[PDB]
Design a protein around this ligand. Structure first.
Ligand SMILES: O=P(O)(O)O[C@H]1[C@H](OP(=O)(O)O)[C@H](OP(=O)(O)O)[C@H](OP(=O)(O)O)[C@@H](OP(=O)(O)O)[C@H]1OP(=O)(O)O
Ligand SMILES: Nc1nc2c(ncn2[C@@H]2O[C@H](COP(=O)(O)OP(=O)(O)OP(=O)(O)O)[C@@H](O)[C@H]2O)c(=O)[nH]1
Ligand SMILES: [Mg+2]
Lengths: 440, 223, 142, 73, 844, 27
RNA sequence: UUUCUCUUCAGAUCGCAUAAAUCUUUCGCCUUUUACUAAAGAUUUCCGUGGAGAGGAA
């Protein structure tokens, strides 16, 4: 079942120098400076927007401003305005400047600047004095050119014991990589973790919380703002779940004679699922005795002969047929893309570029708007994730061309989406199948 | 006043009739001096008449003090609000959203003294709200000519009564536009329940002399 | 380079000290750079700005003297603005008695010809403002 | 330049931006680029007023927003 | 540890040692004591990922990291080999304002411990703390925490590390030698006053414990013969088989370098690297035989476990805390000689000179601690003499109390006693001397300071001097409620928080404002948090900060301020002038006190101040409260004749001057650098007309007429910002300081690590978020710290009615002085039109 | 979009009684 | 030693992240509704996960 592991030292160093591309080699836990979680919660509850992007709507307290015009407590004459009190100061320690706080968190005060000697390559010794800091002491007051007084007792002070660590490996082995494993916070600091799922690892979460833009346009900035908004709103609605009594599906089906397990190739299973979905929808439309409609295997419901006598009022689905059509269209599209890959497509990085465009199309091309308009949240998420990559991918030689990118986050979001929305369609089919098969 | 009704705990600026005419540099300067002056003047005048015959209620009244600390000076007559401040005695920001500035010249000296910045009061605003809501609820059979006539009556009630202030109240203009759009709702939706896209206003702004309605409009109806 | 810029480009403490010696040790614009330097050489704070050159010091002293003269001229203009007898045909020597109580007219400069020139300049400025107001009114005269 | 709404009551409410003096073949190319169907298979109607693949766009004088019942061949 | 054994050892002897730690910005303290608690309380296990505090019982320190509440703890530490001892350790925060808090709380400990970072080294807080501790005459035991941050983070060789430690000790000893001439405590690199710690990894030991380890495993006699030369400058000689302090061989290092640091780096490189290969081959030689499940950990907890098994139970620090940190029986003499108001010549002095639990009782509560119920806060205090018991009443007293002033007394029954552990509490029925007890029931009559005597029989008992801080709080903030019908709850919370934080002080000016005085921004932040959250649940409004200024005379007075009495029988004349700045700083630094002979003050003025003979011999009186720099003088030809009659009316004059200096006409604040010389002073022979009714106020009028008519000038404070950051952050700090009225004092590449320490001043007017602005632009690499210890005169001359900052601009002109004048008089409610020069001129 | 959409009073996204969205890339 | 079965207890960021629905409040809309917008609180559903019997292959 591939439960937890126990990794070795250099096995992690090799993976670390591989993943050095997608990683943050600026380990201090201080460069955030109230662009972290707690500062965002404080910016929300205080109703002031940090310039990082997350400008939320206020809390339940809908008080905007102008509580009083000119009190003796807030008079402009009796103030020594030597400098301004911006929003950053109000976010740092809000209980002082913020008038009437409520539901506020605090942020750490990490002065210990994480020092480290990032060497060049693993040819130098382990403990090499990098000419980086300063002279050692530049001392000249020490004056011990002559011998010391502790001589008689020194001769009377033998060393009747073996040395400390004379039988040691000269403290110079494959250990500097072991030291570097320490500062790798999440991945490599853990030497024996636990079996984690593929989509759980975002591979992009560490980018949009490090002040990426340094002159980038409004697009990337609004993108990172939206991503941080989703991130913080996810952090809020997080209560420990403990319920459901461990109810599992696809565990009792195999016990009955309505299921059989098999080991069939993935493309085969995908084509099987697509054909099964088309067969189900075709049998649905055929049970309704509508002999003038056709899905066309791209799941684009096509008319035949301009049904306009009393038929256009008979085919106004609107709700679930629309949505199941969109979902199966997306699924069959991905499957057929990978079928063309196996069937002699471009076969290069063009594949992954196509997948990126396919998630863009699910944003725009795939017609799922009508059944559910809440899609636009995750579609703006995907469209912001897009420019999150190109300004990290199309940097340097690649400056204009179509970066094929990756679906590390897109596919992840759509997986979470379908996982959350499976029960809605279960309910809608339970409500609809009885109407087309039992009564009304 | 302190002998008759003291307020040692600073509970004298608690309940005070203040106006929403930009209370950042125009509300009453709620200092310990002007507030107490206003309250004690109100009570002194209340002490004159008997409370049985009549008595000005503070919850319905409104004071407006003026000193070295309170340069703003509010009015609320039967119509629209008003605020006056001098032109050569450390005037305020003088926003002047519209072209409403009353160069109150000196009677004898003939020199610019003040600028009585006006603003439509909330009472007339609520009256207009009620009028628009009553017109919207007048549906079912009402011919559109009568509706346009009623709205023209409402607008020439609002406009031509106060003109300098109708432009100074940005909320007033925004609400006029919203009300015109609300009338267009069922002025275009009365025919077919679609709420279409373009639908030019020329179906309305043609007067009845040619056949149309005569909707004397104020909001930007871009043709 | 950053330190030398914060010192010399902003000596920045020395530049502030030169301005401060010109503002505190000197208050009237009647003294020039050379005379003020010969007088203030005895002071102990004058040596604090030794890092700066004599040319920059004389230039800062001249700038401070000019700013003080400008402040005195603005004060005299504010005193003349309150003058009720001042009009288009106001006299210089005749109105000098009105500017006797106002210290901004006497303390600004002891040059009576300069006082008459300032009166003429104020008259010209008032006439320009009046012509501007008249043109603005005629623009709105139907 | 013109915006057209290649519409239908079967999950296809498409908005194609057509040219002013353009033909309809290119309009069908755009309708396929935004709809996801072969070029020669698309059909455009307005109560059996079948627009053809050679009659121009300004010939019928379509303007911004003129929706068209989409059908397939 | 058994609590019965703790009680038996408590009333056992003076072996129980009292200690108060000392550190700065996480340089070794709460993780160290977490390791200690894990060693003493084994069931209280530390986590694996996050660090365990065991000192921040409250929440603010947890949410910020910067501790605020000093949480003292007492532990049964059998760290002395073949022995056991009791240690009363007072944990301490590190922030500057909280550093002043600790310095106020350091009266209790008979000695002092220091935790310096192995890499960062000396900081500003230690630069003040060494001087403070040497001023209090307490012991010193240096220790160095965060040593793993040197071997692992920097990856240095042994020799460079040892030279770094040498430089650290040299700088510390130089600072101490500059503080005083304590030859007994100074020069302590190897005598036992140097402890080592890696609190995050529990790597902590000393020379004595190291030699004990070698003697225990396979070795020779104890460190008395071996550890006397493990310090450098003496290498090992395997030919002679001894330490060759003479000319050694070539390929040889110091005994520290090769006996200690060699196997240290060896086991570090064997645990960090080669954890799969070289782990058992290196651990079965000298280490533990931990199971295979123990080796399945991450690197950090496994390393900490191995370091803990190596230093098995941390038997290294009790060996020094008993060595130089004296017992209370010894430290009772100097601690009481420095704290008690009277001298040792008093009967109570020699009585409490010994730690006799059966005798005159002299308790002293310093820190007030709250409970789960905010309505009742306990009090912690050091029992110097006597023995307190459950229910015993005691005569609580105040700082203003005196032998003649019986007004600051109030009886109270000690309800329930506890022991300070900061995670639990052990109830007590009987407490001997040299003890820390959590007092209950006495919460009401307590003030910022506290002293206790017996309710009867303890008569003729003086009190302890009011503590100093070494950091004058200058910040001034107003705190008024949201709804004005919440005043008494807000004020109750304010009083409770005042009793919590001793550094601050409540106040209500004439304008009816609720004022608070803090030492720093974070100080006021934590104060207001504990107020609004703990001591008062009312929503409260807050204004912006402002620095409490003072006045000064720029030059000599023009005319003699002749303030004549109203009886037409007293004509006082006082001419005021300034004095040298260093002399005023010494008068404030307690250098030249007032209680001295005429010849003593004469020599002090002729040598230090360089005053004249008759000038110094004619010293009139001191400043307000005998602590501020306000020089009174009285010298003249008739002053030498009729000084007797004026001497009869001189007490009232000095009192009026002391009360006038407390609030002057400039900004209703203090005054400094004033030498008031009384020349003309008519004194009538009749004390009826020449009584006090025309003594105090006439003198006040003369003083204000001299201070206002003598070229006044304010005095704004300057902080001292020490920002350890790299070179790019150095340029950024230069930019910010230039943009906020800065003045680059010192900037250099501090060795040990790449951190260019930028030492420069910031004024409090422009210090509203210096740390925030430095950490915003520097990308989180410039965590600086400020301390207000330098007052300077602003360049303005706010007397001329020409400059007026009408709009909301930040007064860029040198009329900034007049701007702050108008602002302060508007905030205080006094007559903003300050033109009393003609009114208080007193023409005659 | 032929209009200027700047001379308008404050703003007009769509008065079609469906303005669920709220955004204009100001931040 | 390795896995699959299942009744069972979870307040561990049960899952170093993150989906939806229902209800109750507050905004923006609004021509009626369903689809909606962005903030707070609670209850469930789905992708799951952790620790303890018994029963089945190497
Ligand atoms: O035309 P731009 O405003 O410059 O932005 C484009 C555009 O994305 P957006 O319109 O959402 O910003 C493209 O997306 P599509 O037009 O294809 O939908 C995208 O191309 P990809 O689809 O391949 O991601 C990429 O253009 P490019 O591929 O050249 O990177 C992108 O940014 P740029 O055009 O500025 O590069
Ligand atoms: N283990 C370990 N941590 C160190 C060391 N030096 C600094 N630290 C850091 O500081 C943390 C522990 O802080 P403490 O030394 O306990 O600090 P503290 O007493 O809370 O200090 P303040 O509250 O700032 O006064 C560790 O978890 C590290 O992050 C060191 O030598 N060892
Ligand atoms: Mg601490």
């Amino acid at each position: 079942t591939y439960q937890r592991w126990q990794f070795t030292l250099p096995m992690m160093s090799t993976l670390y120098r591989l993943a050095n591309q997608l990683l943050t080699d600026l380990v201090d836990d201080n460069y955030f400076y109230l662009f972290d979680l707690k500062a965002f919660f404080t910016s929300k509850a205080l109703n002031m927007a940090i310039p990082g992007g997350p400008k939320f709507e206020p809390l339940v307290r809908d008080i905007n401003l102008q509580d009083e015009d000119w009190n003796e407590f807030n008079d402009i004459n009796k103030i020594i305005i030597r400098q301004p009190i911006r929003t950053e100061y109000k976010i740092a320690f809000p209980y002082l400047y913020n008038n009437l706080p409520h539901h506020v968190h605090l942020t750490w005060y990490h002065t210990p600047n994480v020092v480290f000697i990032k060497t060049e390559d693993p040819d130098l010794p382990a403990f090499y004095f990098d000419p980086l800091i300063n002279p050692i002491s530049h001392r000249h007051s020490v004056k011990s050119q002559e011998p010391l007084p502790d001589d008689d007792e020194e001769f009377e002070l033998p060393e009747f014991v073996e040395p400390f660590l004379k039988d040691t490996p000269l403290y110079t082995d494959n250990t500097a990589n072991g030291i570097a494993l320490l500062w790798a916070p999440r991945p490599f600091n853990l030497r024996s973790g636990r079996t984690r799922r593929a989509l759980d690892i975002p591979l992009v979460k560490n980018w949009y919380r490090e002040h990426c833009p340094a002159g980038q346009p409004v697009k990337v900035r609004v993108s990172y703002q939206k991503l941080l908004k989703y991130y913080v709103l996810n952090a809020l609605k997080h209560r420990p779940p403990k319920a459901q009594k461990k109810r599992y599906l696809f565990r009792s089906f195999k016990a009955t004679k309505f299921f059989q397990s098999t080991k069939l190739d993935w493309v085969e299973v995908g084509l099987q699922v697509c054909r099964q979905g088309y067969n189900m929808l075709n049998l649905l439309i055929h049970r309704k005795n509508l002999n003038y409609l056709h899905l066309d295997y791209n799941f684009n419901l096509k008319p035949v002969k301009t049904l306009t006598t009393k038929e256009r009022k008979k085919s106004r689905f609107g709700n679930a047929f629309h949505l199941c059509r969109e979902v199966l269209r997306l699924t069959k599209l991905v499957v057929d893309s990978h079928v063309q890959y196996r069937l002699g497509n471009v076969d290069a990085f063009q594949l992954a570029d196509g997948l990126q465009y396919i998630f863009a199309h699910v944003g725009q091309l795939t017609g799922m708007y009508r059944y559910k308009y809440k899609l636009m949240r995750q579609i703006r998420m995907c469209k912001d994730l897009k420019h999150l990559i190109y300004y990290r991918f199309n940097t340097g030689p690649v400056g204009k061309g179509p970066g094929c990118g990756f679906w590390a986050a897109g596919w992840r979001v759509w997986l979470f989406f379908m996982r959350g929305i499976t029960p809605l369609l279960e309910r809608w089919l339970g409500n609809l199948l009885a109407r087309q098969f039992e009564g009304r | 006043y302190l002998t008759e009704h003291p307020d040692p705990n600073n509970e004298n600026i608690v309940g005070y009739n203040n106006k929403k005419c930009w209370p950042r540099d125009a509300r009453m300067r709620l200092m310990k001096h002007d507030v107490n002056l206003g309250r004690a003047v109100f009570w002194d005048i209340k002490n004159r008449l008997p409370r049985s015959v009549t008595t000005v209620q503070w919850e319905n009244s409104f004071v407006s003090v003026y000193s070295k600390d309170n340069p703003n000076l509010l009015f609320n007559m039967c119509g629209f609000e008003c605020r006056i401040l001098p032109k050569c005695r450390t005037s305020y920001e003088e926003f002047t959203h519209k072209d409403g500035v009353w160069n109150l010249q000196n009677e004898v000296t003939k020199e610019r003294t003040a600028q009585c910045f006006l603003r439509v009061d909330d009472e007339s605003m609520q009256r207009f709200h009620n009028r628009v809501r009553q017109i919207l609820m007048a549906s079912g059979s009402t011919t559109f000519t009568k509706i346009v006539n009623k709205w023209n009556t409402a607008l020439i009630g609002l406009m031509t009564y106060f003109r300098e202030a109708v432009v100074n109240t940005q909320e007033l203009l925004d609400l006029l536009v919203k009300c015109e759009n609300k009338i267009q709702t069922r002025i275009k939706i009365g025919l077919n329940s679609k709420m279409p896209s373009r639908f030019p206003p020329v179906v309305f702004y043609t007067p009845k002399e040619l056949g149309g309605l005569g909707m004397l409009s104020m909001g930007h109806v871009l043709i | 380079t950053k330190e030398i810029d914060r010192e010399r480009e902003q000596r920045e403490e020395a530049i502030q000290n030169f301005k401060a010696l010109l503002s505190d040790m000197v208050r009237s614009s009647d003294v020039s750079w050379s005379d003020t330097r010969r007088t203030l050489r005895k002071d102990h704070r004058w040596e604090s700005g030794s890092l700066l050159e004599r040319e920059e010091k004389e230039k800062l002293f001249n700038e401070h003297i000019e700013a003080l003269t400008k402040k005195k001229r603005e004060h005299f203009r504010q005193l003349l603005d309150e003058t009720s007898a001042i009009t288009l045909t106001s006299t210089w020597k005749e109105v000098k008695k009105i500017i006797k109580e106002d210290p901004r007219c006497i303390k600004f400069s002891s040059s009576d010809r300069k006082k008459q020139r300032e009166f003429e300049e104020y008259i010209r400025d008032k006439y320009i403002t009046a012509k501007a107001d008249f043109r603005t009114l005629l623009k709105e005269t139907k | 330049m013109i915006e057209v709404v290649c519409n239908d009551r079967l999950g296809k409410k498409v908005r194609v931006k057509c040219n002013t003096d353009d033909t309809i073949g290119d309009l069908k190319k755009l309708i396929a680029a935004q709809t996801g169907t072969r070029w020669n298979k698309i059909v455009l109607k307005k109560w059996y007023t079948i627009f053809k693949d050679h009659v121009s766009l300004g010939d019928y004088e379509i303007h911004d927003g003129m929706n068209l019942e989409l059908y397939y061949q | 540890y058994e609590m019965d054994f703790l009680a038996d050892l408590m009333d056992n002897s003076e072996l129980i040692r009292n200690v108060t730690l000392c550190g700065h910005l996480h340089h070794g303290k709460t993780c160290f004591v977490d390791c200690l608690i894990e060693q003493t309380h084994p069931e209280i296990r530390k986590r694996y990922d996050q660090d365990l505090c065991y000192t921040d019982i409250l929440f603010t320190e947890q949410e910020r990291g910067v501790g605020i509440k000093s949480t003292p703890v007492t532990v049964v530490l059998p760290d002395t080999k073949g022995k056991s001892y009791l240690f009363n350790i007072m944990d301490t925060p590190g922030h500057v304002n909280f550093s002043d808090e600790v310095t106020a709380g350091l009266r209790i400990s008979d000695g002092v411990v220091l935790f310096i970072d192995a890499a960062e080294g000396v900081m500003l807080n230690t630069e003040r703390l060494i001087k403070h501790a040497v001023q209090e005459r307490l012991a010193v035991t240096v220790c160095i925490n965060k040593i793993d941050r040197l071997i692992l983070e920097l990856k240095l060789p042994p020799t460079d590390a040892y030279y770094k430690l040498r430089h650290i000790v040299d700088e510390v000893n130089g600072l101490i030698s500059m503080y005083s001439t304590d030859e007994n405590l100074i020069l302590s690199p190897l005598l036992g006053n140097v402890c080592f710690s890696s609190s995050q990894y529990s790597i902590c030991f000393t020379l004595g414990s190291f030699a004990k380890i070698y003697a225990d495993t396979f070795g020779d006699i104890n460190y008395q013969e071996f550890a006397k030369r493990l310090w450098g400058d003496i290498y090992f000689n395997p030919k002679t088989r001894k330490f060759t302090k003479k000319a050694p061989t070539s390929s040889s290092q110091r005994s520290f370098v090769e006996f200690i640091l060699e196997p240290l780096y060896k086991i570090l490189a064997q645990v960090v690297g080669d954890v799969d290969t070289s782990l058992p081959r290196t651990l079965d030689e000298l280490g533990i035989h931990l199971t295979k499940e123990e080796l399945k950990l991450n690197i950090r907890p496994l390393l900490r476990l191995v370091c803990k098994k190596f230093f098995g139970e941390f038997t290294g620090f009790v060996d020094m805390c008993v060595q130089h940190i004296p017992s209370p029986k010894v430290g009772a003499k100097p601690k009481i000689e420095h704290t008690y108001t009277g001298g040792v010549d008093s009967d109570l002095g020699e009585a409490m000179s010994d730690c006799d639990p059966d005798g005159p009782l002299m308790c002293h509560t310093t820190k007030m601690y709250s409970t789960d119920d905010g309505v009742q806060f306990h009090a912690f205090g050091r029992v110097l003499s006597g023995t307190i018991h459950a229910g015993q009443p005691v005569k609580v007293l105040g700082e203003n109390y005196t032998l003649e002033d019986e007004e600051d007394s109030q009886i109270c029954t000690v309800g329930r006693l506890w022991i300070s552990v900061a995670r639990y509490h052990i109830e007590v029925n009987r407490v001997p001397a040299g003890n820390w007890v959590l007092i209950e029931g006495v919460d009401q009559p307590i003030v910022k300071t506290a002293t206790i005597t017996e309710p009867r029989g303890n008569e003729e008992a003086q009190i302890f001097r009011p503590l100093k801080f070494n950091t004058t709080s200058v910040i001034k903030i107003a705190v008024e409620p949201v709804n004005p019908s919440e005043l008494p709850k807000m004020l109750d919370g304010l009083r409770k928080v005042n009793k919590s934080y001793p550094s601050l002080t409540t106040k209500v000016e004439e304008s009816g404002e609720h004022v608070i005085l803090g030492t720093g921004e974070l100080y006021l932040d934590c104060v207001m948090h504990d107020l609004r959250k703990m001591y008062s649940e009312i929503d409260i409004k807050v204004a912006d900060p402002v620095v409490t200024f003072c006045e000064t005379v720029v030059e000599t007075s023009s005319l003699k301020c002749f303030a004549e009495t109203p009886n037409k029988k007293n004509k006082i004349t006082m001419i005021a002038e300034p004095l040298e700045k260093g002399l005023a700083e010494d008068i404030e630094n307690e250098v030249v006190q007032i209680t001295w002979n005429r010849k003593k003050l004469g020599e002090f003025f002729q040598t230090k101040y360089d005053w004249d003979l008759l000038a110094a011999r004619s010293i009139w009186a001191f400043g307000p409260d005998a602590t501020g720099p306000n020089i009174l003088v009285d010298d003249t030809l008739p002053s030498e004749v009729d000084k007797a009659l004026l001497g009869s009316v001189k007490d009232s004059i000095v009192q009026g001057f002391q009360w006038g200096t407390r609030e002057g006409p400039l900004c209703d604040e203090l005054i400094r650098n004033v030498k008031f010389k009384i020349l003309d002073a008519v004194v009538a022979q009749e004390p009826l007309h020449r009584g006090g009714g025309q003594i105090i106020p006439t003198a006040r009028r003369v003083v204000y007429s001299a201070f206002l008519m003598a070229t006044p000038r304010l005095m704004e404070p300057y902080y001292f910002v020490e920002v350890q950051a790299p070179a790019d952050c150095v340029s950024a700090v230069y930019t910010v300081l230039a943009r906020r009225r800065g003045h680059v004092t010192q900037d250099a590449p501090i060795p040990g690590s790449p951190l260019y320490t930028i030492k420069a001043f910031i004024p409090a007017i422009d210090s509203f978020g210096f740390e925030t602005d430095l950490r915003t632009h520097t990308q989180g690499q410039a965590f600086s710290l400020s301390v207000f210890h330098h007052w300077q005169i602003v360049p303005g001359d706010p007397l001329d009615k020409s400059i007026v900052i009408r709009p909301l601009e930040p007064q860029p002109a040198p009329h900034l002085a007049r701007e702050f004048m108008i602002k302060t008089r508007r905030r205080k409610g006094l007559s903003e039109d300050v033109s009393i020069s003609k009114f208080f001129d007193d023409p005659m | 979009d032929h209009f200027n959409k700047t001379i308008l009073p404050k703003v007009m996204q769509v008065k079609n009684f469906g303005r669920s969205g709220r955004t204009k890339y100001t931040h």
